[PDB]
Amino acid sequence: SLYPPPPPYVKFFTQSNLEKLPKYKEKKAASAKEEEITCALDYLIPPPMPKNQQYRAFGSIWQENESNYQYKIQELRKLLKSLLLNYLELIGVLSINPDMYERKVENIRTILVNIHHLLNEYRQSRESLIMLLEEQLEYKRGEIREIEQVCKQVHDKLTSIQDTLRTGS
Template sequence: MADGGQQRALTAAFPPPPPFWKHFTPENIQKLEEIKQEAAKKEDAKPKRKWSPAELRALDVPPELRFLVPPEIPNSGYYSVFGELQSLSTALPSLKDQGIEQLYPSPPATEAGDTSPSRPARPLNHAYYLLKISKSLLLNFLEFVGVLSIAPEQFESKLEDLRNLFINAHHLLNLYRPHQARESLIMMMEEQLDRTREEIRQMDQVKEKVESILERLRLEGLEADAATDSVKKETEKGTGPDEKTVEEARQIWNLLSADDD
């Protein structure tokens, strides 16, 4: 009885959290970190190094901390999510494998050993068949409403038709997932490339600005050196600009003083 209740809880639309969530407390997390640090000291390793699940399970961990150790990542088979088995394979299973009637043709496969480029496989026109399924959904929904108004007890067959149409449309859309993933990756890489180009452009602008400042400082330094050399040469000759100015000022002062007398 308990197993049945647990199974219903796992498959509910909004299942409760698993019972071991109570073990994820700050105290238990701190205890696990202390165990990791002690083990790292014994191994002369970094205290903050990353531990794999296998290494954590090999440690002497108390029972109340076992739930804090993550399990190994599965690499094949199936895994359970809320009571439902999910396949690790990324290949999309066909509707035939799931026991569902397929309402659109499968893309033609090339014959074994036929690698001639002159006979490529014709791609499936997804948009055309999605449009047909959408129109069939509208028509079958109108028929479903009519059945409910006339003979409600005969709704099951029409409801099954609607369900089959929705599954086919969903499966047809899922065939686009690899293409969508490639296009999303291309878009992300293009955005990253644009950001990198913009950063390089800004760096080039800063580089040009710094080079112009350095060139201006260099020219100012050359002008200052030239002026200093000129002053030194004139001073050595005894006709520096300072002495000449002083002499002219002295003569003007003498003239003014003579007029006062």
């Protein structure tokens, strides 16, 4: 069907199984002193994390104070200059002998592809943390400073009123 069937073990665990789970896990721990499914109550025991700390799904694999970059910068600049130079040479190829133009085209793309690699090491979450950091920091400083400004102006008004009433005495 369109919707896959519920998992099979879901139907094994009734309320009685839930209430008898404590004694079952106590007995299992006492006896113990891929997990084989010898009893229907085994699944409620929390599954163990794989030792390799890896998870595979759909053909793809998955697994501290914030809780020479100049070399990369100059590499990027020289790569951009070489990319412009190669673009000029490739368009010249198109001009004179376009029949073999593709011979350079993908080459240029490789440099562009390398640029993407040069982005990968530069990857930005810390920079986003920084920018959010300063925006809420400056917002709270603005709120604070307007607080002492308003309380100070109220105090100044109170002192002026006190002087006015003392003069009228």
